[PDB]
Ligand binder design. Structure first.
Ligand SMILES: [Mg+2]
Ligand SMILES: [Mg+2]
Lengths: 80, 60, 81, 183, 129, 149
RNA sequence: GUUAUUCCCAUGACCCGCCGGGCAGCUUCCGGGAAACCAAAGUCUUUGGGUUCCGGGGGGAGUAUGGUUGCAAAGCUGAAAC
RNA sequence: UCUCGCCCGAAGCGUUUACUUUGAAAAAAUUAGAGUGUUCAAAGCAGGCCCGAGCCGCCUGGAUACCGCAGCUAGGAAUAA
């Protein structure tokens, strides 16, 4: 015997993105809070463009297969 | 093979059964099509002339 | 099986399995009739009664029986709350 | 447009006019309007009030309702006040209705799209997460529907109200559920 | 690719019954597939089931009873005119009073013998026993 | 798997069940559209325009935040490229592989891949003629590819 | 949990994972198979997922003859008597 | 729509089928089948009863059925277009 309706939330993180029952994706929005002048930047984690802020005007994310990584002293959270 | 309320069954199924009564293969009771299926070859060998002659005597 | 005359002709009822609900045949000699005992109340003494489990062959081969016994004891409610 | 609004709605329609009187809803309810309402018992003797909303004007009932559900409860009994809109349920064209020289039909006016959007409307302060049509061993259908965990206690007591309201609107046997929200 | 999705479903239950499992999944839905299981629920060969609402096209989780030996689909869906079902009675179902056949009649999805009570008939969905 | 290469990977994206954005992204549909006119004035793909909002400006899928889709938004006030982008990109490399064959008329691995890319054009011509957004007189031989980079 | 730039700072290098698709393997009475064997050669008399090419006792034989292509060598299509 | 003589006819007079069920429509003959002791049977459409002539005689039978596909009409609106 086996369960489908009530699996474990341990089990379903492990399973693939679109292979679970609700299929909600695995990326997140991250709150890059650069010390540039004032601005909190919402930026996609699995990004593809060089996310250049408009105040400080430098790099905040690297385009990388998978997910971006941050440059120097940039802190973040999730908006939920 | 046919439905229950089939009037083609009701005229053909009855009249076949009445034919079996007018020969006397069956009883005058059971009027169902499955009781036709319960028949055999020895009823017909009884209802031939010589065996009813053998049942009405003088046959020897 | 009963007819329209309600007649008992049918020979025996073969032991249908517990997990599979599958019929155990006559010559299926890998069947099993498991029997786990009742215990009492607070005393923890043997009740003179028990509960009977019957499992079929293909469950028994594939290792499936061990999930089936303890979950049926759970379906009894005799191994966990 | 051939309306004369009745007594309990007149108690309702005066209450909104009483809310734009030098409170936080003055220029707001000067640009917010009326459709209809009803007065519905759920649970026996405890009656839940609901009102109806013009559909382009829903966002005025949507962005501003949390203080507004407090206010209208002050004027009405402290009983349950839930908000839904005016949905024109258009039937499909059957072959013998006519070809009435009508348009296509939209899918904001059709049945499957209508009454799933009222489950949206009832549970406003909490986003629904997942419905489960559990098929009971007959011709009956449960709606076991997941709900958010963020505003959970806000929509804790409302679930006693909701199943009674959604059967009179729609005719469906629901059961709102509180599990976790799972990212 | 993905075509005739009733044939998709009735291999999932068949492979889970002959494996002997407890509950299965069928990753698309249809009002075809809801009403076909509604035929099987009303007769009781399979237990409860429960449709997980995906906003695109849901999934079905069936609590198995364990009765089924074969749940199939007639693949091109031959049309059925009446007095031709006894042909399909001899052909498909194993005995004379076991099994059912699922028909697509003028007033919905029906049962084998419920179809000639309606005396309408229609196209096939499949067979089960 | 796929059409012209037997790969059966599964790399897709899925929208979650959750609807329009809950707390942040204070950004109206009129404000989304005014940014999105600005992007396609600067000359970017609708497949690129969706990327631009998605990383940089915090925006989710535009279907929720506007009620509409970015090409229907685009066509409202006339910014069309007038040759669709499925047909644009496949032509944009079909010119190059013909050009690469013009200095290597022995690279027959590249010759076979031209057949696959010419396959994909004339299938996609058949679809766009069926929705009537691409008119029935339209053709594709050699030089239609060239000036339409 | 180590180790290399210089040490946060990134990636390297292994170590224990979970995901996807990939070439393969081990075992198993899922069953299938005439058997060898097969996770597909399974879900088949409890036979109907969609779809293309094909075999019908061995010989004569891809032979004779036609068309058709090839500069040619030969290719494709293909009998019959017995 | 009550242009015609509160309900009815009729009148504006319909995006189609496919499919399904009824309804028509068919030539018999042959076949399934009814009925009939042609002496039974294959047949055939025959006969059955009263009146000692006597009544310018009675009664019933010579059925029913499937008639592919296609065309037609009226019901059914599931699946597939
Ligand atoms: Mg292909
Ligand atoms: Mg092929």
């Amino acid at each position: 015997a086996k369960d489908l309706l009530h699996p474990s939330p341990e089990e379903e993180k492990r399973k693939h993105k679109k292979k679970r029952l609700v299929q909600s994706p695995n990326s997140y929005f991250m709150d890059v809070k650069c010390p540039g002048c004032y601005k909190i930047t919402t930026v996609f984690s699995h990004a593809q463009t060089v996310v250049l802020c408009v105040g400080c005007s430098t790099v905040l994310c690297q385009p990388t297969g998978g997910k971006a990584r941050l440059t120097e002293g940039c802190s973040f959270r999730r908006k939920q | 093979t046919l439905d229950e309320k089939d009037p083609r069954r009701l005229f053909e199924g009855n009249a076949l059964l009445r034919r079996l009564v007018r020969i006397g293969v069956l009883d005058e009771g059971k009027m169902k099509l499955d009781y036709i299926l319960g028949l055999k070859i020895e009823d017909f060998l009884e209802r031939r002339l010589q065996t009813q002659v053998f049942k009405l005597g003088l046959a020897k | 099986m009963q007819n329209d005359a309600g007649e008992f002709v049918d020979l025996y009822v073969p032991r249908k399995c517990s997990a599979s609900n599958r019929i155990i045949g006559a010559k299926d000699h890998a069947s099993i009739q498991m029997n786990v005992a009742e215990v009492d109340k607070v005393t923890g003494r043997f009740n003179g009664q028990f509960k009977t489990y019957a499992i079929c062959g293909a469950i028994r081969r594939m290792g499936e029986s061990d999930d089936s016994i303890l979950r049926l004891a759970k379906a009894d409610g005799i191994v966990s709350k | 447009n051939g309306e004369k609004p009745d007594e309990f709605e007149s108690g309702i329609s005066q209450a909104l006019l009483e809310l734009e009187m030098n409170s936080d809803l003055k220029a707001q309810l000067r640009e917010l309007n009326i459709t209809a309402a009803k007065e519905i018992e759920v649970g026996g003797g405890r009656k839940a009030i609901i009102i109806f909303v013009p559909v382009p004007q829903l966002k005025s009932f949507q962005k501003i309702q949390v203080r507004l559900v407090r206010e209208l409860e002050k004027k009405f009994s402290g009983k349950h006040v839930v908000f839904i809109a005016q949905r024109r349920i258009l039937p499909k064209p059957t072959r013998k209705s006519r070809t009435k020289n009508k348009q296509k039909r939209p899918r904001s006016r059709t049945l499957t799209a209508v009454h799933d959007a009222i489950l949206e409307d009832l549970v406003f302060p909490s986003e629904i997460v997942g419905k489960r049509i559990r098929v009971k061993l007959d011709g009956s259908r449960l709606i076991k529907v997941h709900l958010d965990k963020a505003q959970q206690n806000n929509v804790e007591h409302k679930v006693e109200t909701f199943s009674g309201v959604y059967k009179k609107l729609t005719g469906k046997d629901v059961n709102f559920e509180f599990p976790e929200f799972q990212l | 690719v993905r075509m005739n999705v009733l044939a998709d479903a009735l291999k999932s239950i068949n492979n889970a019954e002959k494996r002997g499992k407890r509950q299965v999944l069928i990753r698309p839905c249809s009002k075809v597939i809801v009403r076909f299981l509604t035929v099987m629920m009303k007769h009781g060969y399979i237990g409860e089931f429960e449709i997980i609402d995906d906003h695109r096209a849901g999934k079905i989780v069936v609590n198995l009873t364990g009765r089924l030996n074969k749940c199939g689909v007639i693949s091109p869906r031959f049309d059925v005119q009446l007095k031709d079902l006894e042909k399909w009675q001899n052909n498909l179902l194993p005995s004379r009073q076991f099994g059912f056949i699922v028909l697509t009649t003028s007033a919905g999805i029906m049962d084998h013998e419920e179809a000639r009570r309606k005396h309408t008939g229609g196209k096939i969905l499949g067979f089960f026993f | 798997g796929r059409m012209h290469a037997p790969g059966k990977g599964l790399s897709q994206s899925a929208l979650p069940y959750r609807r329009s954005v809950p707390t942040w992204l204070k950004l109206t549909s009129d404000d989304v559209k005014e940014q999105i006119y600005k992007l396609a004035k600067k000359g970017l793909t609708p497949s690129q325009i969706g990327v631009i909002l998605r990383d940089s400006h915090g925006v989710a899928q535009v279907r929720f935040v506007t009620g509409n889709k970015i090409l229907r938004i685009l066509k409202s006030k006339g910014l069309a490229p007038d040759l669709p982008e499925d047909l644009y990109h496949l032509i944009k490399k079909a010119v190059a592989v013909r050009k690469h064959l013009e200095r290597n008329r022995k690279d027959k691995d590249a010759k076979f891949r031209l057949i696959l890319i010419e396959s994909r054009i004339h299938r996609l011509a058949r679809y766009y003629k069926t929705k009537r957004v691409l008119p029935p007189n339209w053709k594709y031989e050699s030089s239609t590819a060239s000036a339409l980079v």
